[PDB]
């Protein structure tokens, strides 16, 4: 029951696909397992590159195919190389870049908690066993990750485990257990751009939306809350150009709905103030003076936004 | 007349192409059919991976090519492997990812009823028969499908059937009947994002559109419904950024037309109220007071769009 | 001079590229020509799939390469298969998907008259001849083509013809005439979405644009036609998000220019009415009353594209 | 020193990448050079297609690799074919589609002067010589180039020349001179769409921008030029949806800056007219009457731009 | 310990991916190392092209695989060619185009300081040594780089160095040192388009935003700063169409936040001026006259934006 020692060098994790729950990993893969001793020219290990590996397999060299369980489709293998040793052992070294899949909760948006994962596991081989797994995270923790979209938590987490497949084959005297390495890498989103060029101006607009109560006339109060209405729509549109398409409402997405609400409340009170009277065109002296009543009736509905 | 036993593991169904009626399916394919007994090294089944399969076919091993009837173009086969048994039987195992086609009615938009389908059928072989078909849908019961775009109904539906091709070959003594597996998987769209950040604010804008009648002057009433007009256009524009391009009008698409309608009605009544009088500038006392007459003359044309 | 019998099964015609005059066709191709009789294992026709075809060609089997003349680049051939008969004849069967080119006039936009074309023609062979051509349009008539973007007219049109190339080779004793099948499929665009969510609201905006004349003041009349101006610009922008990029003006594209015209006419008259007087601030009593004069000077004076 | 006769058939030149200075060319390539006489089955020329060419090269047939100097990356070769003659000569015929590079000045935008270029030149071969070059431009002189994005000038320009590489090899007794065909095809952009749906409405908006001076009040004159300001911004946005991304300012791009200028001039004069006085709130009687002074102070500083 | 002489010809550096920190380089690669003398047909160097190189490697010709360390995935190798000399030496010549990665700070946006990098290094070979490195920057001086997006500083910088890998193999008696060429090319962004069609109009809008103080009424002053508010939002939206998506705030991105600030300040002062009085509707005589107080209280704030 063969022993394989894996080493996976992560080079870059880049381009997260928010809708599809997908990210890209470029790196190298190394596998080493010890075989029947061999006569190597010189007595120095043999190096077999690219084209030439398929040839040694055709001669009878076993090289197991190991699959990225959670990869999308099939990845882009750069330079492969077999290093064959005189005393038997064989080191397989391939550079790769490919798209991976994991569960990805983007709900708490621009303050985001994510984890990138690879899953390696021998494709066709039951009892060959992944010995020990190593992971070399190149790029560094605090560094210049302000140039970078993501900050990694985070040194690489490993986990060799055994996975059982229920629906097995026409072999069953105890043959459904495959050796799976699982590599995790925690990360957090760089909440910069989204705070300053996003949350803040949306706030200023929500804020200035309230200065509709400091207009004198009733006519001025209603008509102004209309260009206010469409200032929100014009903003949502700008949100739709920059923000990543999702199937749930993000933090930002809500703030923007709160905007529509604050101004639709405004419209209701402004119209209420004018036709709740005893004597003619008498605007409700006190209600029109919620000037600084629902700015903190929003910071109050807005501390229950944060349950 | 050969018996083939198929097993199809669905891994992910992702990325629906709304215009092209296309979706992506990642999974494994398994086929098993029993052949002439064979001498296998050891007396344990033989494993043949990737490169090596073509070699056994070149020696004379039959392996049938089975086509995804409804795939688009040709898919991305990851790791293939033949498992050859001593007693004859052969298991073919390949991982795949590829784009599929089905009819797709998106009319009832954000509350959407869809079904994903595979169609497998032997490419060139008349009498070899698909025995029984199995389908392993990877998730379960009460999940986290709120992270996910689609909810599956839905345990996999199967259906082995016989399909006849009218325009056949130069063989015809009863040879036009191919064995076709058909796998269905029902699903529903996660109406979340589209309700909260879409239907609702469109409603609030439709609603507030009506508070044009609570303006005093006639001048105020007409001029306001103009910025109201373009508030709708600025909204439709935001719809065009997020919503999926279609060749029919969706539910949302209609609501937005109703918006244009309500405000064009407004412009008609507002101008009518002013010039339906006697000899002067006497606004029609009662008509201008449809204030809460066609908000429920809208909720009334509104057991129509989805009734 | 060899006789080849072609059969082309169209499966889907999807994804029109409006700028590049390109569409995608997924289907099967069948070619059958009779050769020197052969010893086939059993005495049943031989089936040769994929990998194995190149092997028979290497042994000496002729299989002609036939080119899609009007394809873009080179297509995506799925499953090929040779069926070799004992009495000689050979049937070539390949599934394909690829991008095609034809002239495409999108001028009369959302009411669109288009025709999809394949052109098959033996690549390197002068006297081998395309016998007869068959075309199996799967995709059906009054069906559910409301789910579909295009309606096909339209049963497939054929046409085997001979095409002569002027600039020939160093062979010329009558050798410049190649056998070309040409398959046409007429189609019309589903003018749904574009009428309802496009032509109509553009009309309502053009319409309501005219109610600028029913404002009292001159100040109200000018200032209002300005937000009216940019309502059009905001609309064109929404046009730009949904409509397919072209190098000519479509029907819609014009209607939108008529919008800019109507409102620039408005600006002219409104300013004229105010400074054409037999006095001081006396608005031209009658000119300001073109209220329902150029709404039907628009349904008119610009109504001759049906010339 | 071998004589090669080239023939290049241009089929389509489509999809210009404005940023990257890239265009696509689909066509055929033909090379003919005479070799040592050969025994051809029959005594008719031999035809070798696709798979089979590599086989004759493996036997020792020289076929030179000729490179598109200015191609991007490496192209998509469709059907290749060697035609081998009994008297020696060899005709190489390949269909191709690939992306090419040339210098591309888009400055004078929608009235555009462009030229598409191929550069063919033997990859590894010093003294083999490109004999004479032929170019068959399919697309026509008097046509329907209104369906087409570009109009070709323009019959194909040729030019076989010798090019010297300074930094050569370890061969230098006069060995740095390679034979290069250079094919040019002049073209002009179809200024249609951009005149009618772009330049014109930008003009009307520039025009109507001036009718700000025909407002009575000073309040009306300032406040109106603001919605006028953002009408320009809303237009520039529409520009950004349809126009091709560039690294310089186009003709249109300027016209749009002139728009921002005219209205920022307006804001300056309008505010000047109000506080350049004698008796209090006395608007400068004459300055406010530049009503038709800087519309032709724009047709004046605007015609120095181009000319 | 083998000596390799590298020569890298840069043809084009194009298409920078701002988010992924990626650029494309098209060029040629040359490697020359001297081997055991050889019998070459004639006694002139042998030329081996494309298909044929793999054949000589199969015979036993060593050709080392050299990897672009920093490339993304794996590049597009055009025409390869071995030139084998009688005296042993071998020149390897390949054309390539591929995507590379470097750190890329876009913070100081449209005035941008960037450097493009290649890293070459023998994939599997410890003691073979990169001799000397040459780099032929075709692309030119002061030239016509106004047609071009980038201006190169900048003649090519080289640097052969030794790199040590900590986590090495089962070989360790001093075997972890690989020979790495590193080629740098400095560049600056063409600040044209972004100055004229971007910074400037953003300035005019910021500028004209201040003429809100030269309105008479208080009602006019508040209501106008609202359309002023959404003039900024409409601008940011135009920013989002043209500017490259980033994860930090650029120069421009700030200027635009300053806009939102200036107008939210305005709204604050304008509302302050009105309710900071004795008793009645007496606008604060002096505060309303910050007319030209915070235009230079902005040229004072947007000036510690560099210091």
């Amino acid at each position: 029951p063969v022993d394989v020692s894996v080493s996976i060098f992560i080079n870059k994790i880049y381009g997260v696909n928010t809708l599809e729950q997908t990210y890209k990993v470029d790196g190298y893969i190394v596998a080493q397992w010890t075989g029947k001793p061999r006569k190597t020219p010189g007595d120095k290990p043999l190096i077999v590159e690219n084209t030439q590996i398929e040839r040694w397999i055709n001669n009878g060299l076993w090289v197991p195919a190991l699959e990225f369980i959670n990869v999308v489709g099939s990845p882009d293998t750069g330079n492969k190389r077999l290093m064959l040793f005189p005393d038997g052992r064989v080191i397989y070294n391939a550079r790769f870049l490919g798209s991976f899949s994991n569960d990805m909760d983007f709900r708490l948006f621009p303050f985001d908690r994510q984890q990138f994962v690879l899953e390696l596991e021998p494709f066709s081989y039951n009892n060959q066993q992944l010995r020990f797994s190593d992971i070399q995270v190149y790029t560094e923790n605090i560094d210049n990750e302000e140039i970078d979209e993501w900050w990694i938590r985070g040194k690489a987490s490993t986990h060799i485990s055994d996975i059982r497949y229920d629906h097995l084959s026409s072999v069953q005297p105890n043959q459904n257990e495959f050796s799976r390495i699982t590599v995790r890498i925690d990360a957090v989103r760089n909440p910069s751009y989204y705070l300053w060029s996003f949350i803040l101006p949306l706030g200023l607009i929500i804020a200035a939306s309230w200065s509709v109560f400091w207009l004198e006339s009733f006519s001025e109060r209603l008509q102004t809350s209309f260009t206010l209405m469409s200032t929100v729509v014009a903003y949502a549109l700008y949100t739709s150009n920059i923000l990543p398409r999702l199937p749930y409402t993000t933090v930002i997405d809500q703030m923007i709905i709160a905007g529509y609400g604050s101004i639709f409340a405004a419209i209701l009170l402004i119209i209420f103030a004018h036709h709740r009277q005893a004597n003619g065109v008498e605007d409700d002296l006190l209600i029109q003076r919620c000037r600084l009543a629902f700015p903190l009736g929003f910071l109050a509905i807005g501390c229950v936004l944060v349950i």
Side-chain angles (χ1 to χ4, degrees), chain A residues 5 7 9 28-33 45-54 56-57 61 63-64 66 77-85 89-96:
Chain A
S5 150
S7 326
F9 291 56
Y28 297 87
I29 240 281
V30 169
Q32 169 180 343
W33 27 279
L46 224 252
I47 282 174
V48 187
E49 285 174 335
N50 303 317
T51 321
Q52 298 303 326
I53 284 121
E54 258 169 45
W56 285 64
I57 306 172
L61 214 203
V63 213
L66 335 77
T77 33
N79 286 15
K80 14 185 170 162
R81 148 216 117 185
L82 273 191
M83 227 205 287
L84 311 152
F85 273 86
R89 56 172 190 256
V90 165
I91 283 160
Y92 173 55
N93 190 36
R95 158 83 174 247
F96 73 102

Short mmCIF file of all heavy atoms in Angstrom, two decimals, chain A residues 5 7 9 28-33 45-54 56-57 61 63-64 66 77-85 89-96:
data_model
loop_
_atom_site.label_atom_id
_atom_site.label_comp_id
_atom_site.label_asym_id
_atom_site.label_seq_id
_atom_site.Cartn_x
_atom_site.Cartn_y
_atom_site.Cartn_z
N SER A 5 4.39 11.25 -0.77
CA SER A 5 4.59 12.46 0.00
C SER A 5 4.39 13.67 -0.88
O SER A 5 5.16 13.91 -1.81
CB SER A 5 6.00 12.51 0.59
OG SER A 5 6.45 13.85 0.73
N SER A 7 3.86 17.79 -1.78
CA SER A 7 4.23 19.16 -1.49
C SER A 7 3.58 20.07 -2.56
O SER A 7 3.72 19.86 -3.76
CB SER A 7 5.77 19.29 -1.45
OG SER A 7 6.37 18.09 -0.94
N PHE A 9 3.09 23.97 -3.72
CA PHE A 9 3.54 25.35 -3.55
C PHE A 9 2.50 26.32 -4.10
O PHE A 9 2.31 26.37 -5.31
CB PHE A 9 4.86 25.59 -4.29
CG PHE A 9 6.03 24.87 -3.70
CD1 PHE A 9 6.01 23.49 -3.53
CD2 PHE A 9 7.17 25.57 -3.35
CE1 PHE A 9 7.10 22.83 -2.99
CE2 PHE A 9 8.28 24.91 -2.82
CZ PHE A 9 8.25 23.54 -2.64
N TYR A 28 2.89 24.91 -7.80
CA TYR A 28 3.54 23.70 -8.22
C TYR A 28 3.00 22.56 -7.39
O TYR A 28 2.53 22.76 -6.27
CB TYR A 28 5.03 23.80 -8.03
CG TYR A 28 5.74 24.86 -8.84
CD1 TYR A 28 5.85 26.16 -8.37
CD2 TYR A 28 6.34 24.54 -10.05
CE1 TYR A 28 6.53 27.15 -9.10
CE2 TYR A 28 7.02 25.51 -10.79
CZ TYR A 28 7.12 26.83 -10.32
OH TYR A 28 7.80 27.82 -11.05
N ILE A 29 3.08 21.37 -7.95
CA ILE A 29 2.69 20.19 -7.23
C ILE A 29 3.89 19.23 -7.18
O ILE A 29 4.60 19.06 -8.18
CB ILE A 29 1.49 19.56 -7.90
CG1 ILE A 29 0.31 19.51 -6.93
CG2 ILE A 29 1.79 18.18 -8.35
CD1 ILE A 29 0.38 18.38 -5.93
N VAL A 30 4.15 18.63 -6.02
CA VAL A 30 5.22 17.63 -5.94
C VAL A 30 4.75 16.36 -5.27
O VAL A 30 4.15 16.39 -4.19
CB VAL A 30 6.43 18.16 -5.20
CG1 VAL A 30 7.38 17.04 -4.91
CG2 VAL A 30 7.11 19.21 -6.02
N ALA A 31 5.00 15.23 -5.92
CA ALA A 31 4.68 13.94 -5.33
C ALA A 31 5.90 13.07 -5.35
O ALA A 31 6.60 13.03 -6.35
CB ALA A 31 3.57 13.28 -6.09
N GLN A 32 6.15 12.37 -4.24
CA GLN A 32 7.30 11.46 -4.14
C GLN A 32 6.91 10.13 -3.48
O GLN A 32 6.29 10.10 -2.42
CB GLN A 32 8.46 12.13 -3.39
CG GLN A 32 9.58 11.19 -2.98
CD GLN A 32 10.71 11.90 -2.24
OE1 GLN A 32 10.82 13.13 -2.29
NE2 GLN A 32 11.56 11.13 -1.55
N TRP A 33 7.25 9.03 -4.14
CA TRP A 33 6.90 7.70 -3.69
C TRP A 33 8.07 6.85 -4.09
O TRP A 33 8.68 7.14 -5.11
CB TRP A 33 5.64 7.22 -4.41
CG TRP A 33 5.45 7.86 -5.77
CD1 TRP A 33 4.92 9.10 -6.04
CD2 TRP A 33 5.77 7.28 -7.03
NE1 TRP A 33 4.91 9.33 -7.41
CE2 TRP A 33 5.42 8.23 -8.03
CE3 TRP A 33 6.32 6.07 -7.41
CZ2 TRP A 33 5.60 7.99 -9.36
CZ3 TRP A 33 6.51 5.84 -8.73
CH2 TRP A 33 6.15 6.80 -9.70
N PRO A 45 20.58 10.70 -10.18
CA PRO A 45 19.16 10.60 -10.50
C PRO A 45 18.90 11.05 -11.94
O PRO A 45 19.64 11.87 -12.51
CB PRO A 45 18.51 11.54 -9.47
CG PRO A 45 19.65 12.35 -8.89
CD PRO A 45 20.81 11.44 -8.93
N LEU A 46 17.87 10.48 -12.55
CA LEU A 46 17.55 10.80 -13.93
C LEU A 46 16.51 11.91 -13.97
O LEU A 46 15.61 11.95 -13.13
CB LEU A 46 17.03 9.56 -14.64
CG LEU A 46 17.64 9.41 -16.03
CD1 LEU A 46 16.57 9.72 -17.05
CD2 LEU A 46 18.89 10.31 -16.18
N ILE A 47 16.64 12.83 -14.93
CA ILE A 47 15.61 13.84 -15.11
C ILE A 47 14.84 13.65 -16.42
O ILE A 47 15.42 13.66 -17.50
CB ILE A 47 16.18 15.25 -15.01
CG1 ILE A 47 16.38 15.59 -13.54
CG2 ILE A 47 15.23 16.27 -15.58
CD1 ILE A 47 17.06 16.90 -13.35
N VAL A 48 13.52 13.46 -16.31
CA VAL A 48 12.66 13.28 -17.46
C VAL A 48 11.64 14.42 -17.53
O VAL A 48 10.82 14.56 -16.64
CB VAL A 48 11.94 11.95 -17.36
CG1 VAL A 48 11.19 11.67 -18.62
CG2 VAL A 48 12.95 10.86 -17.15
N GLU A 49 11.72 15.23 -18.60
CA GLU A 49 10.88 16.43 -18.76
C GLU A 49 9.78 16.28 -19.83
O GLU A 49 10.00 15.76 -20.92
CB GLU A 49 11.74 17.62 -19.17
CG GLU A 49 12.60 18.27 -18.11
CD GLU A 49 13.52 19.35 -18.69
OE1 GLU A 49 13.85 19.29 -19.91
OE2 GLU A 49 13.92 20.28 -17.95
N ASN A 50 8.58 16.77 -19.49
CA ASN A 50 7.47 16.98 -20.43
C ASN A 50 7.11 15.85 -21.42
O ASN A 50 6.42 14.90 -21.04
CB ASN A 50 7.66 18.29 -21.18
CG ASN A 50 7.76 19.46 -20.24
OD1 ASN A 50 7.01 19.54 -19.27
ND2 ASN A 50 8.71 20.35 -20.51
N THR A 51 7.56 15.97 -22.67
CA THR A 51 7.27 15.00 -23.73
C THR A 51 7.63 13.62 -23.27
O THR A 51 6.93 12.65 -23.52
CB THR A 51 8.15 15.23 -24.97
OG1 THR A 51 8.30 16.62 -25.22
CG2 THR A 51 7.55 14.54 -26.21
N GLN A 52 8.76 13.57 -22.57
CA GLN A 52 9.43 12.31 -22.31
C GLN A 52 8.78 11.46 -21.23
O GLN A 52 9.00 10.26 -21.17
CB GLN A 52 10.89 12.59 -21.98
CG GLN A 52 11.64 13.26 -23.13
CD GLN A 52 11.56 12.43 -24.41
OE1 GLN A 52 11.55 11.19 -24.39
NE2 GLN A 52 11.51 13.12 -25.55
N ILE A 53 7.98 12.07 -20.37
CA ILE A 53 7.36 11.27 -19.34
C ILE A 53 6.43 10.22 -19.94
O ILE A 53 6.52 9.05 -19.58
CB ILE A 53 6.65 12.12 -18.31
CG1 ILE A 53 7.68 12.76 -17.39
CG2 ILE A 53 5.74 11.25 -17.47
CD1 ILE A 53 7.62 14.26 -17.38
N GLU A 54 5.57 10.63 -20.88
CA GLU A 54 4.60 9.70 -21.48
C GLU A 54 5.30 8.49 -22.04
O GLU A 54 4.71 7.41 -22.13
CB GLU A 54 3.82 10.36 -22.60
CG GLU A 54 2.44 10.78 -22.22
CD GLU A 54 1.82 11.67 -23.27
OE1 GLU A 54 1.92 11.33 -24.47
OE2 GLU A 54 1.23 12.72 -22.90
N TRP A 56 8.08 7.00 -20.73
CA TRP A 56 8.43 6.08 -19.66
C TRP A 56 7.21 5.38 -19.13
O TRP A 56 7.32 4.30 -18.60
CB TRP A 56 9.12 6.80 -18.53
CG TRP A 56 10.53 7.16 -18.85
CD1 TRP A 56 10.97 8.01 -19.82
CD2 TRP A 56 11.70 6.69 -18.17
NE1 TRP A 56 12.33 8.10 -19.78
CE2 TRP A 56 12.81 7.30 -18.78
CE3 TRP A 56 11.91 5.81 -17.10
CZ2 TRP A 56 14.11 7.05 -18.37
CZ3 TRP A 56 13.20 5.55 -16.70
CH2 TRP A 56 14.29 6.17 -17.33
N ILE A 57 6.06 6.00 -19.28
CA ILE A 57 4.84 5.35 -18.86
C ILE A 57 4.49 4.25 -19.86
O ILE A 57 4.07 3.15 -19.48
CB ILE A 57 3.68 6.36 -18.67
CG1 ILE A 57 4.13 7.46 -17.73
CG2 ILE A 57 2.47 5.66 -18.09
CD1 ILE A 57 3.17 8.60 -17.60
N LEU A 61 6.58 2.41 -16.57
CA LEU A 61 6.70 3.19 -15.34
C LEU A 61 5.31 3.53 -14.87
O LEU A 61 4.54 4.11 -15.62
CB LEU A 61 7.45 4.49 -15.58
CG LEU A 61 8.33 5.01 -14.45
CD1 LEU A 61 8.52 6.48 -14.61
CD2 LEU A 61 7.79 4.68 -13.07
N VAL A 63 2.99 5.96 -13.00
CA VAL A 63 2.89 7.28 -12.37
C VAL A 63 1.40 7.45 -12.14
O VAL A 63 0.62 7.40 -13.09
CB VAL A 63 3.45 8.47 -13.22
CG1 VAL A 63 4.02 9.50 -12.32
CG2 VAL A 63 4.55 8.04 -14.19
N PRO A 64 0.98 7.61 -10.87
CA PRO A 64 -0.46 7.69 -10.59
C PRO A 64 -1.06 9.05 -11.00
O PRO A 64 -0.43 10.13 -11.01
CB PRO A 64 -0.55 7.47 -9.08
CG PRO A 64 0.77 7.99 -8.56
CD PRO A 64 1.81 7.76 -9.65
N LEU A 66 -3.36 11.85 -10.03
CA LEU A 66 -3.97 12.44 -8.84
C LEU A 66 -4.80 13.65 -9.25
O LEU A 66 -4.33 14.55 -9.97
CB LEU A 66 -2.90 12.85 -7.82
CG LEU A 66 -1.54 12.14 -7.82
CD1 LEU A 66 -0.62 12.63 -8.99
CD2 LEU A 66 -0.88 12.26 -6.44
N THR A 77 -1.62 22.56 -16.84
CA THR A 77 -0.33 22.06 -16.37
C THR A 77 0.83 22.57 -17.24
O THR A 77 0.91 22.26 -18.41
CB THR A 77 -0.33 20.52 -16.25
OG1 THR A 77 -1.18 19.95 -17.26
CG2 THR A 77 -0.83 20.08 -14.84
N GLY A 78 1.69 23.39 -16.65
CA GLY A 78 2.86 23.95 -17.32
C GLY A 78 3.94 22.90 -17.50
O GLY A 78 3.74 21.97 -18.28
N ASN A 79 5.07 23.02 -16.79
CA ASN A 79 6.17 22.06 -16.95
C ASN A 79 6.19 20.85 -16.03
O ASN A 79 6.37 20.97 -14.83
CB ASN A 79 7.51 22.77 -16.93
CG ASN A 79 7.77 23.54 -18.21
OD1 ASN A 79 6.84 23.76 -18.98
ND2 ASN A 79 9.02 23.94 -18.45
N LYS A 80 6.00 19.66 -16.58
CA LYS A 80 6.06 18.49 -15.75
C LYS A 80 7.47 17.96 -15.81
O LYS A 80 8.20 18.26 -16.75
CB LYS A 80 5.05 17.41 -16.17
CG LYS A 80 4.39 17.57 -17.52
CD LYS A 80 3.35 16.48 -17.70
CE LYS A 80 2.48 16.70 -18.93
NZ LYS A 80 1.79 15.43 -19.30
N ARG A 81 7.85 17.18 -14.81
CA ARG A 81 9.15 16.55 -14.81
C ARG A 81 9.18 15.39 -13.82
O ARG A 81 8.77 15.53 -12.67
CB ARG A 81 10.22 17.60 -14.48
CG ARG A 81 11.41 17.09 -13.71
CD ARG A 81 11.88 18.13 -12.75
NE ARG A 81 11.76 17.66 -11.38
CZ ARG A 81 12.02 18.42 -10.34
NH1 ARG A 81 12.41 19.68 -10.55
NH2 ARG A 81 11.89 17.94 -9.10
N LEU A 82 9.63 14.22 -14.30
CA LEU A 82 9.94 13.10 -13.42
C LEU A 82 11.41 13.14 -13.03
O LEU A 82 12.27 13.30 -13.90
CB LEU A 82 9.60 11.75 -14.08
CG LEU A 82 8.15 11.38 -13.82
CD1 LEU A 82 7.81 9.98 -14.22
CD2 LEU A 82 7.78 11.60 -12.37
N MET A 83 11.69 13.04 -11.74
CA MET A 83 13.04 12.79 -11.26
C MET A 83 13.08 11.37 -10.70
O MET A 83 12.43 11.07 -9.71
CB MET A 83 13.44 13.79 -10.20
CG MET A 83 14.81 14.37 -10.42
SD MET A 83 15.50 14.93 -8.85
CE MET A 83 14.57 16.42 -8.46
N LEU A 84 13.84 10.50 -11.38
CA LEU A 84 13.95 9.09 -11.03
C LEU A 84 15.26 8.84 -10.32
O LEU A 84 16.32 9.24 -10.79
CB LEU A 84 13.92 8.25 -12.28
CG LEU A 84 12.80 8.57 -13.23
CD1 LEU A 84 13.28 8.20 -14.61
CD2 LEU A 84 11.58 7.80 -12.87
N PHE A 85 15.19 8.15 -9.19
CA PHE A 85 16.38 7.93 -8.39
C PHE A 85 16.91 6.51 -8.58
O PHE A 85 16.14 5.61 -8.93
CB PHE A 85 16.06 8.23 -6.94
CG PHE A 85 16.26 9.67 -6.59
CD1 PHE A 85 15.25 10.58 -6.78
CD2 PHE A 85 17.46 10.11 -6.09
CE1 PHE A 85 15.44 11.90 -6.48
CE2 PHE A 85 17.65 11.43 -5.78
CZ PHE A 85 16.64 12.32 -5.97
N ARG A 89 13.13 5.61 -5.65
CA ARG A 89 12.17 6.68 -5.43
C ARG A 89 12.05 7.61 -6.61
O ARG A 89 13.01 7.80 -7.35
CB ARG A 89 12.50 7.45 -4.16
CG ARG A 89 13.88 8.02 -4.13
CD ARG A 89 14.06 8.93 -2.93
NE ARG A 89 15.32 9.65 -3.03
CZ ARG A 89 16.40 9.35 -2.32
NH1 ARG A 89 16.35 8.35 -1.45
NH2 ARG A 89 17.52 10.04 -2.48
N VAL A 90 10.85 8.16 -6.76
CA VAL A 90 10.47 9.01 -7.89
C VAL A 90 9.77 10.26 -7.41
O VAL A 90 8.85 10.20 -6.60
CB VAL A 90 9.56 8.25 -8.85
CG1 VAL A 90 8.88 9.21 -9.80
CG2 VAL A 90 10.37 7.22 -9.60
N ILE A 91 10.25 11.40 -7.89
CA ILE A 91 9.68 12.69 -7.55
C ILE A 91 8.99 13.29 -8.76
O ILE A 91 9.62 13.49 -9.79
CB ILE A 91 10.79 13.65 -7.12
CG1 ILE A 91 11.24 13.32 -5.71
CG2 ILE A 91 10.32 15.09 -7.19
CD1 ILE A 91 12.60 13.87 -5.40
N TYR A 92 7.70 13.58 -8.64
CA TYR A 92 6.97 14.21 -9.72
C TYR A 92 6.69 15.66 -9.41
O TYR A 92 6.11 15.98 -8.38
CB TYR A 92 5.66 13.50 -9.96
CG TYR A 92 4.77 14.21 -10.95
CD1 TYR A 92 5.22 14.52 -12.21
CD2 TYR A 92 3.46 14.53 -10.62
CE1 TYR A 92 4.39 15.14 -13.11
CE2 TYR A 92 2.62 15.15 -11.52
CZ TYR A 92 3.09 15.45 -12.76
OH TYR A 92 2.27 16.07 -13.65
N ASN A 93 7.08 16.51 -10.35
CA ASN A 93 7.07 17.94 -10.14
C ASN A 93 6.37 18.60 -11.31
O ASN A 93 6.84 18.55 -12.43
CB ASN A 93 8.51 18.45 -10.03
CG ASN A 93 8.58 19.88 -9.58
OD1 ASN A 93 7.79 20.30 -8.76
ND2 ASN A 93 9.54 20.64 -10.12
N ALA A 94 5.22 19.20 -11.05
CA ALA A 94 4.51 19.90 -12.11
C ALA A 94 4.04 21.26 -11.62
O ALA A 94 3.62 21.40 -10.47
CB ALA A 94 3.37 19.08 -12.61
N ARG A 95 4.15 22.24 -12.51
CA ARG A 95 3.65 23.60 -12.31
C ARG A 95 2.21 23.58 -12.81
O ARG A 95 1.90 22.87 -13.76
CB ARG A 95 4.50 24.57 -13.12
CG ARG A 95 3.82 25.89 -13.44
CD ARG A 95 3.92 26.89 -12.29
NE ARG A 95 3.38 28.20 -12.66
CZ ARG A 95 4.09 29.32 -12.79
NH1 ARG A 95 5.41 29.34 -12.58
NH2 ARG A 95 3.46 30.43 -13.13
N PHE A 96 1.31 24.31 -12.16
CA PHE A 96 -0.09 24.27 -12.56
C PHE A 96 -0.73 25.61 -12.26
O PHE A 96 -0.29 26.35 -11.37
CB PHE A 96 -0.86 23.13 -11.86
CG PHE A 96 -1.12 23.38 -10.40
CD1 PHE A 96 -2.36 23.79 -9.97
CD2 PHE A 96 -0.12 23.23 -9.47
CE1 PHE A 96 -2.59 24.05 -8.66
CE2 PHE A 96 -0.34 23.48 -8.15
CZ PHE A 96 -1.58 23.89 -7.75
#
